[PDB]
Symmetry: C3
């Protein structure tokens, strides 16, 4: 059975409070769903979809065998007896239908159940997405991963030197050295392209590199203006391969 | 028109809603279900929901007149004494948000939610005010950030001794990048540098070997930052003539 | 006094808990005005609390404290006590019990404040943290005043030829490699003859990591290849080992 404990304005209100759109859910299994043959029984699961709260209380959905089943909550607000029904479908058919601003049936997938010919072999929930703008927090613990913006830049610095720069969170940069340097003196600026503004550090950064197949090393300074100063020893006309990773903060 | 739902207790629900979403009186929740329409020096909110002070209301074809050649700060104003129309919009020359607690006392709440810049003839750009979620501790599985994460940063300059200087920057109380400066002289391999030890908040759990480079040379050194904060020299021996020491090395505290 | 409001109260309770991402072991709490500390008492002037998705207000509500003690202030919710389901207690420990009052019977106890006293009055107060338990967050900007804890994995590799690597990976992305051991019998371009880097630490692209020979002016680098093998790119080393040290960093992604 399904209990359905409203107004369009409350639907919108609740969606805004929790930061959900029409393509996700809030979901809590208070007790575990139970698998029997080609069926899942939701014993006590609460769902919020489109800001509308409902409960799955010993509600069984029947499955297709040897398949990945996409379990959907389907909300039809005019079906005043049973507004919510469950379906098992061959694809994620979530439709993003706005049931608080317009007519229509909201379909939203919340579970993925894989079956053999005779029973359930695995279950994976659909993620519950909280879409937020700016967060001020004291502490955070992450069990998976944080995805931050990444930008890349290849710089032909001059004299054969190449830098491949990767910047994450607009702050941490790792520079990978490539190419082969020749015709440069200590203290000389390299003769090629300056580092693009978004990768320039606030203060001069000395990055250590290594000459491949040798026991010798160099460093370069990436200056705040984007210029690059050579601080290895003088190199004559024979190019020497330059390699290594160096890291700096922009901020 | 403005549809006023959480009004005429409404103050108890207001407080409840503010608490659930983590908002104070100086921010909003806001959703344009359809785009506002800009026409000459006017913005027409076609279908926008706002929560201000935990009070939910809708702007349905509600137009605000704008000042020309100006940055217009669009405010929602909530005055519970104006029983017939407790919410109104204004376009103002500054952000005049006032943080007034309308759920516990009298007063008019003003909160800016849009910034609309105009030429002489119409809207040239619109930028919403950010919706701030003020949270204490978060446990999350995964996060995607489109802008940036700001984490705490601490810096320390250490006169390590023998002319070596370290400038340490620590972020999230964990990742440290050390920048070498100064010039080293009169030191042997294996000796502790004769100066100041690294302050406790920058000390690593395990010894960290940081590679540096001698400016203008093909030669390098490393130092160890020991868990006790001491710094051990692991370049070759250096005589009386100082040699300039540079380079960035990174380590984790934890 | 305690004024109760959220008392289908069970369904609204679960609804509110789900909207804010709270379980039965935390609260939402806001002092709209400052509590008053008066001798061995705290007077909550105007404080709202949500516990188990139930909202209530502490209005001129005084809790007597033990002297020279750390007092754990609890909200206690017993839905069977219809006329006054909520009461406050000051206790010698955090005795929060996580009782599910919206699905089951029982008294929920949840600590929300820690009030420390001298012999005569309050010396400090510290609120209990309000925990938001969320699944996936999509955000524009975030500011953190404390710290972010991300996953950390470590790996020690007996790489071959005497070279040892200690790798630490954070957020499944940033790796810092610490070199140890002493290397011998290797040439430039040769793969180290030991254990390859485990799959979870392998980079998408070849990473050159610079190291230093302890007590010397000389340096080397190794390449960690996407297949997990490690290629020597120092000068050739004969039979006599040389101690290898240093930190190098790379991104996996």
């Amino acid at each position: 059975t399904i209990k359905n404990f409203g107004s369009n304005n409350d639907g919108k209100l609740y969606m805004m409070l929790t930061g959900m759109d029409y393509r996700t859910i809030r979901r809590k299994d208070w007790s575990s769903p139970l698998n029997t043959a080609l069926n899942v029984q939701y014993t006590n699961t609460s769902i919020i979809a489109g800001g509308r709260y409902f409960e799955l209380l010993n509600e069984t959905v029947a499955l297709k065998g040897d398949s990945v089943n996409y379990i959907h909550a389907n909300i039809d607000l005019t079906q005043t007896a049973n507004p919510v029904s469950l379906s098992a479908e061959t694809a994620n058919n979530s439709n993003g239908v706005d049931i608080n601003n317009g007519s229509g049936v909201l379909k939203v997938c919340f579970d993925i159940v894989t079956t053999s010919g005779t029973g359930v072999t695995s279950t994976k929930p659909i993620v519950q997405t909280s879409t937020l703008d700016s967060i001020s927090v004291n502490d955070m613990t992450v069990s998976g991963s944080i995805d931050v913006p990444v930008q890349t830049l290849t710089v032909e610095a001059g004299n054969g030197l190449q830098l491949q720069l990767t910047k994450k969170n607009n702050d941490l940069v790792i520079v990978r050295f490539f190419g082969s340097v020749s015709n440069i003196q200590k203290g000389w600026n390299m003769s090629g392209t300056w580092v693009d503004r978004p990768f320039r550090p606030a203060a001069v950064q000395s990055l250590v590199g290594h000459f491949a197949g040798r026991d010798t090393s160099f460093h370069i300074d990436i200056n705040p203006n984007g210029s690059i100063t050579w601080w290895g020893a003088n190199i004559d006309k024979t190019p020497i391969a330059t390699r290594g990773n160096g890291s700096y903060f922009i901020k």
